[PDB]
Structures are given as C-alpha cells and as structure tokens.
Write a protein that binds this ligand. Structure first.
Ligand SMILES: CC(C)=CC(=O)NCc1cc(-c2nn(CCCN(C)C)c3c2CN(C(=O)CC2CCNCC2)CC3)ccc1C(F)(F)F
Length: 221
C-alpha cells in the first residue's frame, strides 16, 4: 500500500542543503533536518533550525562531542529537555565549537518525542519515510567513492553497516531498475546531485543506511 517513490522536497518540507565544513557536525545537520520537516507539516512554515545550537549545547550530558561527532537521538533529547531549539537565523552555523548560546526568545521549534527504528530493516525505514517524514540516519561515508559521487544510484562494494556520518533520508525511488534512498547531505550544493546522494536501497542495508534510523515529532499542544 506504500508509495513506490517519495520525495519530501515536493511538499516543501526540506530546507536548503547546508555546508558543514571542517566541523564534524553531520549528526547535528541530520537532526535539525528531520525536525524541520515536522515543523513544516505542523505549522506550514519552512525554517532552517540551528545546527550550531546542537553543537554548542547538546554536549557531554548527551554523549555528544560537537565538531568531533554526536548522535541524532540525543540531539532530539536535548531539544526535548531544553524545551526548544533556535532558528539558524538567530543562531547561525560557524563550523566551530562554541559556548552554548541558546536563547528561548528565538525558539523556532520544539520536540515532543523521537522514535528509533530497528537496525537493518529497510522495509520499516520505507514505511517511516512514507508515513512520518524524512528520517535521520547514519551511513558509512568512509570511502573515496562517496566524496567523489556525482550522480546516479551509489553502490560501494566495500561499504560496511558501521555508520560514521549523519544524513537525512528525504525519500526513495527507483532509477532504471535500481532502487535508491534519496539522501540529503550537508556538504553544500557541489556535492553529488545538488547536495543529495541516491544510495542503493534493498541491497542488504548498504552502507548501513538503515542501521540507526530515528525521527522526531512535534505533537499538538
Ligand atoms: C563520536 C560520537 C560522539 C558519536 C558517533 O559515533 N556518531 C556516529 C553515529 C552513531 C550512531 C550509533 N547509534 N548507536 C546506538 C546507541 C546510541 N546511543 C548511545 C546514543 C550506536 C551507534 C554507533 N555504533 C555502531 O556503529 C556499532 C559498532 C561500532 C563499531 N563496531 C562495533 C559496533 C554503536 C551503537 C548512529 C548514528 C551516527 C551518525 F549518524 F552520526 F553517523
């Protein structure tokens, strides 16, 4: 009963691709990316949320290490605990570790909960992308082919299921008989297909795309 193909960009739920630079904050970009879609669905407004807010404030208590890495799930937990996250406009991205400067005056979103999906279940991931929205995931990006990707459905024979880079699944589809996940990266427009990579789908959890998926929600109230 699920759609054969999904692309949440078609519903105006995905902000512009960002550029993380030399700061290892893909976990933070993946987290705000997922929440940006839920905020758009609830309020009608598409607003980039502050990845920097996560880097500076969702730190040791959440197991995160700022520009040295982190988790989307504990980023969501911080937003829940903190009762908000600032807009990127008010708290812009500097690709550096800074003191926490969260200001509730510029809160642009909240988070009520988040859900984790079972490891390696690409069918379950498909259902969530179709029925809930863009899903935060990790992938194994430690391959020159990933950095060098330009177009088409990416398949890396030496990929593993051990994730190391946070990204956002904003959809899925098929290209000339190859199924793919539509993945928003945080390496700017010049990476891949305008900042996106289409990654092999239903090929045994390729590059760990379904190893650790999660997504937040903003509930009425
Ligand atoms: C340096 C740092 C602070 C964080 C980090 O590494 N982030 C990368 C990252 C990690 C995870 C992640 N989630 N889980 C669930 C439990 C998580 N709790 C504890 C919160 C885990 C991981 C990583 N993992 C594994 O891969 C398992 C294997 C790791 C190396 N062989 C042995 C097992 C452990 C459990 C998911 C997404 C991302 C993403 F997207 F950012 F790439």
């Amino acid at each position: 009963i699920l759609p054969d193909s999904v692309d949440w960009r078609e519903k105006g739920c995905v902000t512009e691709v960002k550029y993380q630079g030399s700061c290892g904050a893909s976990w933070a970009f993946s987290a705000v990316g997922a929440l940006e879609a839920q905020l758009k669905l609830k309020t009608g407004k598409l607003v980039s949320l502050s990845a920097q807010n996560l880097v500076d404030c969702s730190t040791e208590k959440y197991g995160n290490k700022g520009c040295n890495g982190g988790f989307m799930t504990t980023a969501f937990q911080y937003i829940i605990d903190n009762k908000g996250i600032d807009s990127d406009a008010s708290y812009p991205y500097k690709a550096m570790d800074q003191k926490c400067q969260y200001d509730s005056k510029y809160r642009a979103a909240t988070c009520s909960k988040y859900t984790e999906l079972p490891y390696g279940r690409e069918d379950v991931l498909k259902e969530a992308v179709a029925n809930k929205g863009p899903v935060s995931v990790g992938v194994d990006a430690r391959h020159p082919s990933f950095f060098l990707y330009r177009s088409g459905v990416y398949y890396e024979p030496s990929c593993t299921q051990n994730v190391n880079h946070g990204v956002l699944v904003v959809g899925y589809g098929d290209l000339n008989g190859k199924e793919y996940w539509l993945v928003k990266n945080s390496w700017g427009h010049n990476f891949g297909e305008e900042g996106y990579i289409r990654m092999a789908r239903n090929k045994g959890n390729h590059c760990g795309i379904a190893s650790f998926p999660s997504y937040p929600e903003i509930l009425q109230g």
